[PDB]
Symmetry: D4
Subunit: 207 residues, 8 copies
């Protein structure tokens, strides 16, 4: 019945069964460099106002119930800036998350009247929802996640279905849903190119 369902290592089968459709997802790590900074938390939400928070142990390389969800082509995974998380999940578990919807790419493609494409600003404008970023820069490898860390992790996925729905309607209205879908199809490759060593260059540029 909990708003924040906590797991160690992997999601339970009962909680994975809550996800009959799209899966909202984010991760927390020790930093922005996957080969240096380990995966610490994976958080998920089915869009019903509750979330799963999964603590990932140091050195952990399998999470079979979660990994099946990530690879399942029948269920879309929704991220805000999936470029990073898709890379972290491939680096850690060897899974290519697919198919994906990225609300940051979607924001860039339809919220053409602003330069503010972060999650907090998207949720404020599109949903009139306030989230706090205070815990983004904390030690996510802690043995005991703090109440504030659990709040942040859950709130970071609780609103992604609703945000995707609003941005999808804007993309359809403004004629860019096809462009968005092509971006989402390339996103796992973009993440893998980062891991391989092209993380600071646009492969489509001249240089």
């Amino acid at each position: 019945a909990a708003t924040i369902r906590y797991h160690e290592g992997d999601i339970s089968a009962e909680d994975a069964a809550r996800y009959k459709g799209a899966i909202a997802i984010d991760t927390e790590t020790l930093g922005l460099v996957p080969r240096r900074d380990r995966l610490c938390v994976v958080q998920l939400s089915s869009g019903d106002g509750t979330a799963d928070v999964i603590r990932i142990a140091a050195g952990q390389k399998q999470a079979p119930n979660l990994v099946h969800m990530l690879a399942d082509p029948a269920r879309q995974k929704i991220f805000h800036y999936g470029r990073f998380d898709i890379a972290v999940l491939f680096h850690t578990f060897g899974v290519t998350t697919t198919p994906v919807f990225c609300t940051k790419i979607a924001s860039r493609l339809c919220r053409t009247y602003t330069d503010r494409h972060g999650l907090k600003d998207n949720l404020k404008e599109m949903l009139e929802v306030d989230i706090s970023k205070a815990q983004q820069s904390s030690d996510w490898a802690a043995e005991t996640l703090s109440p504030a860390q659990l709040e942040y992790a859950a709130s970071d996925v609780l609103y992604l279905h609703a945000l995707r729905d609003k941005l999808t309607a804007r993309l359809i209205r403004d004629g860019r849903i096809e462009h968005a879908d092509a971006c989402f199809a390339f996103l796992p490759t973009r993440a893998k190119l980062d891991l391989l060593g092209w993380d600071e260059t646009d492969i489509f540029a001249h240089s």
Copy 2:
């Protein structure tokens, strides 16, 4: 006879020579598609001959060429297709598909150099020499010169061979799947450029 010249569109007879992949480049009045009109489209089937099609100011149709560009059964090979795909969509409304880009391929496998232009690729990969002297000529000239026609043909005459060599390197070095995904995105990348995202990576934060 190795450079077949056409006004406006390739003939149906010459289009029928293209039984497989189509090497393609364009020439324009500059690097800004909405400012700098398409002036030439050049094609080769990889048999050592080329078709050079001169495009008129204001021309909006080229039915035989457009059918080739849209034909999903025949790959189109470009060097830096990001630009030409945008120009072709801007001019004719056609989305060229499917594509292979030898510049993207070069960037993904020739990791030991920063020289990814066509001339350098042709020299290293094929020992073929081309001259870039006519690159900055007036492609809207009333009469294209013999030097211009030779330059335009040379930009397409070797793309099948270059594609094959770079594909072998992509296989050897493990990046053929990444290259194919880049090629699948390339028409969208070109369309995003036309809409004013030309100086930003849509996959970056900004």
Copy 3:
């Protein structure tokens, strides 16, 4: 009698008849790239403390009463940074707005003691009028403009006659009215050069 007169598609003939002289004008769009971001609103004021707000539909390419006002050489159009709006109006309707007075160019030419040439700062110093920029970055394509969007649109044109008058007096006092008038005569060409593809370069520079 309304302070904010609302129109769909075009201004009414009765309201266009209010403009016996200069026309204060601005636009709202989906962003700063005319070939990508459609025109959404045109707002006008005759300088009497009231404004016309005209919602422009997606795909709309004619607005005959408005376009006649924009092209009428007998009535000056007053913009703050007309470089953008003149381009948007030419892109959308094919009209070359003329003649124009730009209060941003005027500010740059006479308010030589400051680097703050935006509308809010000009209105504060020159008129002791406060305006809020909160709604500048909103979805101007909304089917129902919000009360805050209507306030912003109206306030954005309500003070331009008064601002033009103050800046004109400063330009005369400080000896730069001729320079300003030459800038205003070039402004439609500058806007058209942006649309053609020179939007990021000064055509008068070496490169």
Copy 4:
């Protein structure tokens, strides 16, 4: 006899040769008008001959030249008039009008190159070769050398022909009206430079 040399001002007799447009350039002690004085003004009527006028330190009048510069009935042709118009206004108080600038014209039509200098324009458009060797000489020298006089004349001898070729390109490519509006603004752009706006586009936000 093809380079007519004058001290201070052109003679009335030689000014009367100019029945139409006046090609014009200047030489100075550098690129900062309030620091670097005007040293030479060079003119050509487009007939293959030039007038070279040497300007003295502190000279504030040149009545025959100033009458030509202000005469609204005769166009003045410059390559990058933005600079010379400023120098002439700073020195003599004259606003040169009306003007044609071949550098603005080049930027508006030679969209396929970044080379908009005079030497490159003359080579592409006219197959005329000029040498820039004396560009960085001391133009305030007590005696101008034959090389300096040849350089100064060559900067004006071809501007009518270059104007005509670039005008044809502006017609072909649809930008003659934009060019004319730029020329109408150019004297104001030059005056804004003298006032300290030389490093900013007055039409930008900043």
Copy 5:
């Protein structure tokens, strides 16, 4: 008896006679480019807590009582960033102000523990005096200077003797008084080089 003695055109002989020693001085203009932006106000203080504020008219090229003070080698002129004001005064009146003490140069040479060398920060640290910069960016050519403009002009010179005295003691303590004096001797040339056309380059650099 006034704290702020106002003058039009030139200081009176009676008020110039108050200055038996160093003269604290600043100017106000229409901006930072002397050939474009006219001199509007010259303000002076003898260090006794009162100031002279002299309005300079458009086109005015003489101010004989003031100019004698500026040129008088027997009385030091104290500026905060005299590089600018010395240039403006030479451009306007043809006078080379000498000798000078610049409290900004002095601050840079002895307040080596901070990057904040403006007047407000110097007065706060060295004298525990607060001044407001609100009126720095105002129209100084106004026919009627506002009460706030008069306050700003006076406060800008009221504390310069005291600031010079504190910074002089620091320069002596820390061994850099000779360097400071050499900088002050070069300052009029530095100002003149700005007017001539070297305003954006250090003449002592390679380029």
Copy 6:
């Protein structure tokens, strides 16, 4: 019994005897350029909540009790950004401080989820301790240090043992203690290379 024990010139033998293990240490100077800006204060703490504050006189080149502590290989010296202080101490006294632990290097090596590696931010996150930076940019050469300067100097060393202990545990947890120890072994050379003339280049780069 004092929380802040004050010394002129050198620490007393009795107070040096308090340091049976690691020595927390910082300095204050007239600025960031050792050849220009003299050493003014050395502050130490044994980690018991009290500190020694030693005023260094102008021109002073010996401090034998302090220098013995700095050179003693049996006692670690703990700095936050020791690169600077190690250089200042070598420049002033000729002593090579060794061995060292730098909490800024340690922070950069383990607090990989943040870009905020200053002392104030480290103490806030790692210890929930607040310090004020108000007095960092003050005149540290004053004959009479102010109460606020004494507070700042003491608080700057009071928490370094505790910070070192927390960061050491993080470095061990995250696998980078060996990297940190190698950085600390190079740190005196890095400081000396700064003094010699390589202060603006990484000697390990290509250029």
Copy 7:
């Protein structure tokens, strides 16, 4: 006979030639170790001969080479060891120690020049000429060419001599102790690069 070629690992017999310091360089597919695989390791004992070891894709062991790299009794000499030490650790898991880097040495003593590459060092310090023509070749080629083998050997043949000359300069100019401390840190600097600190000095504020 002066270039001994090996597949995969140096032979035990040839490793036994190395009684003292070991000059070493590598060749790769580019400058990003996790992207661009190790292709060649080249060694010299300083006797005018070299061992060139070609490394296979996916190769993770080279026992004789790794024993040399880890042997604390024999110094390894590199020019810009920061890169090669990282590549060797990434590929084989070995931490090369102890090391001398002639590029660090050059930066610490050749204070009158910005030219710290190997070719310039060899020319000034030894009057030895090497050519960099094969620097940007495909080092993963199925067969390394004679030019590639000569280039690879020349990169190690002179490092003992260069080390000796630069050591003399470090003694003369007072920086040998600083150099030795840099060499002691160099393996850590290389490991920090692999972890993503490659564009930051860990000793700076940021």
Copy 8:
């Protein structure tokens, strides 16, 4: 006989040749005075001959040279004295005064060029050719080579003549008083550099 070589200090006999202005330059181990020691001081009286003084590591005195440098009755001529004045103060504690700097003079009068180095000044102003080949040599060498001695002498042999030509231009173009004030500040500018203000103009806001 035209290059008189000295160890440590000029002889009293050769110092007595200098009855007027003293042309002077130095050579060092690089551009950072506290890192890169003074190695050579070269002087000329303007008579076509030079004194070259080799400076030892750690040398802190040179009494005859220092007396010349401090002598207020004899001007010292440098090209970019900002550097050498700092090196001489750092090494010997002497404040060289009074000075003329031909690089400052060049910047104040050769307003039509960005080429203010010595070689370019000597070529334009005197038609004298010097070669910069030894600029980046090891000036702390145990034996200075004939090429080094020729380079060092050539840096001072023409400074009187260059000073005279640039002074004439400063007179012509109205900036001799500004130049003299710059020269009066130059020793302070050099001392501020040594104190860490070397990358900032003390007269700027920051």
